[PDB]
Amino acid sequence: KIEEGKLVIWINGDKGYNGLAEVGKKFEKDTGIKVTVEHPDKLEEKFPQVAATGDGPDIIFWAHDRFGGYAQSGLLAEITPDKAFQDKLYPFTWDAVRYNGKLIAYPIAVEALSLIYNKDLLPNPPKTWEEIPALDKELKAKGKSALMFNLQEPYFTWPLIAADGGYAFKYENGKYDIKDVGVDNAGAKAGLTFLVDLIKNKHMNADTDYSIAEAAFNKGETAMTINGPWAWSNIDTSKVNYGVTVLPTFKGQPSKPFVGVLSAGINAASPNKELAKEFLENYLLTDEGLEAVNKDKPLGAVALKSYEEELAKDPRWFIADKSGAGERGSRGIIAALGPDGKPSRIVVIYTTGSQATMDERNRQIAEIGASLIKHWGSGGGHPETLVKVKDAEDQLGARVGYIELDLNSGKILESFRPEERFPMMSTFKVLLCGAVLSRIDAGQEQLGRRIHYSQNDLVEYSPVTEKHLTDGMTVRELCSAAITMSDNTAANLLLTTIGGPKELTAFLHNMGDHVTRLDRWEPELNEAIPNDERDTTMPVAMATTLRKLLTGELLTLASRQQLIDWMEADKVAGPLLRSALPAGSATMENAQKGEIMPNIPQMSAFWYAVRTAVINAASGRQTVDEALKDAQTRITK
Ligand SMILES: [Zn+2]
Ligand SMILES: [Zn+2]
């Protein structure tokens, strides 16, 4: 039995438990209830043992993946935060602690691998996996190395393997499909192939494990390592000048590290469930409570939005971006906004001129975006938002176009220069894929259909298409790249499927848009000559057209949802919500791009199977194709 009138907490010894105990002393001062923080050895094993009998701690802190089994045996209580409190934490962290519809833990901290680099050896780290071979050659010639990380465990190699489309178990409608495994797909092959190619070409050694890589980085022998927040303290002691950043992209798409959510569960047998709620919600999950814990030992990243914004201020994450790939997107934004994950408004913004830079445009767009979320519920058209839009035209020194629209009813909520013509830039790309999906609905096109192109077909800013020269790309992939990664060649290839700019224009006119026109291809359509009517639209015309594609019956329910999905990813990567829904620390950035650890018992077989596969493809016993075929079988039939 658990003692009433006190809080007993179990947490791992490597966590900031002395900070946690300080939060408990503050709880004691206010309520008179003492909180005892302990770190039992193998509490991960002690908890399921004692809690079944009715004993143990009131609160247990562990990563979410273990909490699936706990909640199955009925060892955790359903928590009851209200909407106000839930909106304080990142939405994706609430999913990690959801079991059979019920919230079974409070999300606390967020952990994922990051790229850790030596700033003296490498002040500007690679954004890409493909550029590492050449960096290794430049480094080995000066007595160093580019990258060293643990190759023995599939936890460390998976971010690269999953990058191009690999996955453990598909997660749909809030449930894992134990028959849908993606370790055998084309994307998992490409990643492991590239991995084995780094070994073959002597860029990495197949025998490299955790201790070897760590010693190598902490002694300045290697430019980069891949590790988590648990490793920082040792690097701090080594006095290596290090930064922590986003993992490199493989094939133009982010690495996908497994994401662990340190979570606080409440014993089902606890008679202090209400006090546990009071402490967790109103003491621990505050900036002051998490600061106390973080000061003791680094949390990496947290689930509480407000404190993650403080973590993001840490100089270690600071990067120097030089690419002007965001230039088009800062001159043209389209976004379907809506809360609870459901869109109800359409925003169209264009900026112009040859004066303002990319950052200045991105900042102005972010400000308009923050102003929109600030005054939600008011319906739209808040005079504040109009001033922000007017400010953008002011500070950018050129015409700005703007409209805000209710998606369902077509009602104009706010407008500025809505019937003036603006170069579409990249904003035609959603309309292009609307036309594509129109062909799918008519059985004229398949999303899985594969397109060939050579290097000659490549134009500027094509980060995905340029990395699929040998295997080509799928219509579905092309649209994803065109919209979410703003791939220019992807846009052209898609244009060619429908018959060129003239057919997109015809498609738009056939649905009642007699204003919008695409005349040229990428990258020409971006020229934006003053008063040139080629490749232009109006804010109102664009908003209405977009509205008709996401409403009514122009697309099937299947095709409509697909367009919605693509548009959201473009929105969260665009500058619009960069102030309102800001990026966090490097650990959080990697976690948001990654794959939440599945909390199912079937994950055990996955680890063994992938572990063997990576060993056998690296050594030689199996080819990459064969090794993953076998690993897939070991998991599912
Ligand atoms: Zn691919
Ligand atoms: Zn017409």
Numbering used by the authors: 1 to 637
List sentences from the manuscript:
A successful example of this approach is the allosteric protein RG13 which is a molecular switch created by recombining the nonhomologous genes encoding MBP and TEM-1 β-lactamase and subjecting the resulting library to evolutionary pressure. As a consequence, the RG13 gene confers a maltose-dependent ampicillin resistance to E. coli cells. Intriguingly, RG13 activity was serendipitously found to be negatively regulated by Zn2+ at low µM concentrations in a non-competitive and reversible mode, a characteristic that neither parent protein MBP nor TEM-1 possesses. The structure reveals that the TEM-1 and MBP domains are in close proximity to each other connected via two linkers and a bridging Zn2+ ion.
Two types of crystals of RG13 were grown in the presence of high zinc concentration (2.5 mM). These crystals belonged to space groups P1 and C2 and were refined to 2.30 and 2.29Å resolution, respectively. The two RG13 molecules in the P1 space group have a similar conformation as the root-mean-square-deviation (r.m.s.d.) for Cα atoms is 0.39Å (for 636 residues). The two connecting loops between TEM-1 and MBP could only be resolved in the P1 space group (in both monomers) although these loops, not unexpectedly, have higher temperature factors than most of the rest of the protein; part of these linker regions comprising residues 317–327 and 583–584 are not included in the C2 space group structure due to lack of electron density. The residues of the linkers closest to the MBP domain that appear to be anchoring the linker to MBP are residues S585 and R316 as the mainchain and sidechain residues of these residues make numerous stabilizing interactions in the P1 space group. In addition to the two RG13 monomers in the P1 space group, there are four zinc ions present with two zinc ions bound per monomer. The Zn2+ ions bound to the three different RG13 monomers can be grouped in two different classes: the main Zn2+ ion, which bridges the TEM-1 and MBP domains, and the non-interdomain bridging Zn2+ ion. In the P1 structure, residue E477 (E121) has slightly shifted away and therefore the main Zn2+ ion only interacts with H468 (H112) and both oxygens of D164. A similar zinc binding site is also present in the P1 space group involving the same H509 and H514 residues but this zinc binding site is expanded and also includes ligands from a crystallographically related RG13 MBP domain: H39′ and Y17′.
